[PDB]
Design an enzyme around this catalytic site. Sequence first.
Site, PDB file in Angstrom:
ATOM      1  N   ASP A  85       6.383  -1.344   8.016  1.00 40.59           N
ATOM      2  CA  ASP A  85       7.647  -1.969   8.308  1.00 40.59           C
ATOM      3  C   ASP A  85       7.611  -3.136   9.257  1.00 40.59           C
ATOM      4  OD1 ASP A  85      10.274  -0.921   7.561  1.00 40.59           O
ATOM      5  OD2 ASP A  85      10.635  -1.824   9.596  1.00 40.59           O
ATOM      6  N   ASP A  99       8.977  -2.355  16.790  1.00 39.00           N
ATOM      7  CA  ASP A  99       9.789  -1.316  16.170  1.00 39.00           C
ATOM      8  C   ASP A  99       8.895  -0.183  15.755  1.00 39.00           C
ATOM      9  OD1 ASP A  99      12.230  -0.078  15.329  1.00 39.00           O
ATOM     10  OD2 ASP A  99      11.983  -1.068  13.285  1.00 39.00           O
ATOM     11  N   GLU A 139       9.747   6.983  11.694  1.00 40.10           N
ATOM     12  CA  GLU A 139      10.149   6.689  10.328  1.00 40.10           C
ATOM     13  C   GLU A 139       9.386   5.491   9.781  1.00 40.10           C
ATOM     14  OE1 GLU A 139      13.795   7.931  11.901  1.00 40.10           O
ATOM     15  OE2 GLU A 139      12.316   7.195  13.378  1.00 40.10           O
ATOM     16  N   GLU A 161       0.844  -1.195   0.000  1.00 42.05           N
ATOM     17  CA  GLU A 161       0.000   0.000   0.000  1.00 42.05           C
ATOM     18  C   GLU A 161       0.885   1.253   0.000  1.00 42.05           C
ATOM     19  OE1 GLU A 161      -3.297   2.416   2.586  1.00 42.05           O
ATOM     20  OE2 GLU A 161      -2.651   0.474   3.337  1.00 42.05           O
TER      21      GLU A 161
HETATM   22 CL1  LIG Z   1      14.459  -0.796   1.043  1.00 46.38          CL
HETATM   23  C1  LIG Z   1      13.781   0.522   1.907  1.00 46.38           C
HETATM   24  C2  LIG Z   1      14.001   1.830   1.480  1.00 46.38           C
HETATM   25  C3  LIG Z   1      13.421   2.889   2.174  1.00 46.38           C
HETATM   26  C4  LIG Z   1      12.609   2.624   3.280  1.00 46.38           C
HETATM   27  C5  LIG Z   1      12.023   3.838   4.007  1.00 46.38           C
HETATM   28  N1  LIG Z   1      10.905   4.559   3.342  1.00 46.38           N
HETATM   29  C6  LIG Z   1       9.937   3.439   3.599  1.00 46.38           C
HETATM   30  C7  LIG Z   1       8.537   3.903   3.227  1.00 46.38           C
HETATM   31  N2  LIG Z   1       8.197   4.362   1.997  1.00 46.38           N
HETATM   32  C8  LIG Z   1       6.804   4.373   1.574  1.00 46.38           C
HETATM   33  C9  LIG Z   1       5.955   3.261   1.524  1.00 46.38           C
HETATM   34 BR1  LIG Z   1       6.450   1.464   1.847  1.00 46.38          BR
HETATM   35  C10 LIG Z   1       4.617   3.440   1.129  1.00 46.38           C
HETATM   36  N3  LIG Z   1       4.106   4.628   0.839  1.00 46.38           N
HETATM   37  C11 LIG Z   1       4.897   5.710   0.887  1.00 46.38           C
HETATM   38  N4  LIG Z   1       4.643   6.984   0.631  1.00 46.38           N
HETATM   39  C12 LIG Z   1       5.739   7.698   0.842  1.00 46.38           C
HETATM   40  C13 LIG Z   1       5.942   9.061   0.653  1.00 46.38           C
HETATM   41  C14 LIG Z   1       5.016   9.851   0.003  1.00 46.38           C
HETATM   42  C15 LIG Z   1       5.325  11.171  -0.238  1.00 46.38           C
HETATM   43  C16 LIG Z   1       6.569  11.672   0.128  1.00 46.38           C
HETATM   44  C17 LIG Z   1       6.998  13.111  -0.118  1.00 46.38           C
HETATM   45  N5  LIG Z   1       6.455  14.063   0.847  1.00 46.38           N
HETATM   46  C18 LIG Z   1       4.988  14.041   0.770  1.00 46.38           C
HETATM   47  C19 LIG Z   1       4.431  15.032   1.753  1.00 46.38           C
HETATM   48  O1  LIG Z   1       4.947  16.356   1.393  1.00 46.38           O
HETATM   49  C20 LIG Z   1       6.366  16.416   1.452  1.00 46.38           C
HETATM   50  C21 LIG Z   1       6.922  15.399   0.472  1.00 46.38           C
HETATM   51  C22 LIG Z   1       7.510  10.865   0.708  1.00 46.38           C
HETATM   52  C23 LIG Z   1       7.197   9.549   0.955  1.00 46.38           C
HETATM   53  N6  LIG Z   1       6.696   6.853   1.210  1.00 46.38           N
HETATM   54  C24 LIG Z   1       6.242   5.618   1.236  1.00 46.38           C
HETATM   55  C25 LIG Z   1       9.078   5.589   2.008  1.00 46.38           C
HETATM   56  C26 LIG Z   1      10.025   5.740   3.323  1.00 46.38           C
HETATM   57  C27 LIG Z   1      12.391   1.297   3.740  1.00 46.38           C
HETATM   58  C28 LIG Z   1      12.976   0.265   3.018  1.00 46.38           C
END
Ligand SMILES: Clc1ccc(CN2CCN(c3c(Br)cnc4[nH]c(-c5ccc(CN6CCOCC6)cc5)nc34)CC2)cc1
EC number: 2.7.11.1
Length: 255
Positions: A145, A127, A131, A82
């Site tokens: 996570d 956890d 973040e 998601e």
């Molecule tokens: Cl391998 C690995 C690499 C990075 C991570 C850490 N990240 C894990 C989560 N990620 C996301 C996931 Br899963 C699902 N939906 C998301 N949506 C976003 C997201 C959406 C929008 C933004 C940008 N911001 C939006 C709000 O305004 C300021 C800019 C930044 C991140 N990140 C994720 C992004 C953060 C975990 C594992």
Amino acid sequence: RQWALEDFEIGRPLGKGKFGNVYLAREKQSKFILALKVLFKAQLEEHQLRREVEIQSHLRHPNILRLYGYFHDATRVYLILEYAPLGTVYRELQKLSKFDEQRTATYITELANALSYCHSKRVIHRDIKPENLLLGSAGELKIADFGWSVHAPSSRCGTLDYLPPEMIEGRMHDEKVDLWSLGVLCYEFLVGKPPFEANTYQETYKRISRVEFTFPDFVTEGARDLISRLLKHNPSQRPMLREVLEHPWITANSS
Ligand SMILES: Clc1ccc(CN2CCN(c3c(Br)cnc4[nH]c(-c5ccc(CN6CCOCC6)cc5)nc34)CC2)cc1
């Protein structure tokens, strides 16, 4: 189903990671938009992933990020997730420097629900931190996570800030791990930093262990109290989520 890379258009990186990467992506047939976590089987050095997949796949709740599928590629591996349109609680915290009681109490409530649900499946997240907290389109909180999660009870480095005495001490732990973190989180939402921050892994350990936090003068009795109830060394003395959701201060400020 059986899935594959070419079912998906990749888009922007959403975050970096030593294990891999998470892209914005779109399933080609449905134009469905999602988050694809792409992992490097090379660095991995199986154990929790199998777990983080089995566990996440089997949980459905509005306050918990969905796992839709996975598929390996054999130099790489992919979780279909998601996508959470408003990013992390962590960026929201760093942007607005601290949260009002209202935002915080609400967040905590959502969190309580998602957690209560998880424990009702004997699942400990272990956890919970900013973040790993995500925002849906309504600004709704979304636990993410499940990398460290396991069935309860359990036994077990990485950052120490949100972990509880019983866990850093290598003792046996249960669903109450999450209750201590909810308290660390509450604190951090209100204050701007976790109640045991330090410059040293080792010092943070002593802080967590001896349960040492003080509050800024700007922190209300109602929150001090909740946070204090959440952050008790002996896990048995921590409230059920049910009491947490009941807390006058919570009831006074959530939605
Ligand atoms: Cl391998 C690995 C690499 C990075 C991570 C850490 N990240 C894990 C989560 N990620 C996301 C996931 Br899963 C699902 N939906 C998301 N949506 C976003 C997201 C959406 C929008 C933004 C940008 N911001 C939006 C709000 O305004 C300021 C800019 C930044 C991140 N990140 C994720 C992004 C953060 C975990 C594992």
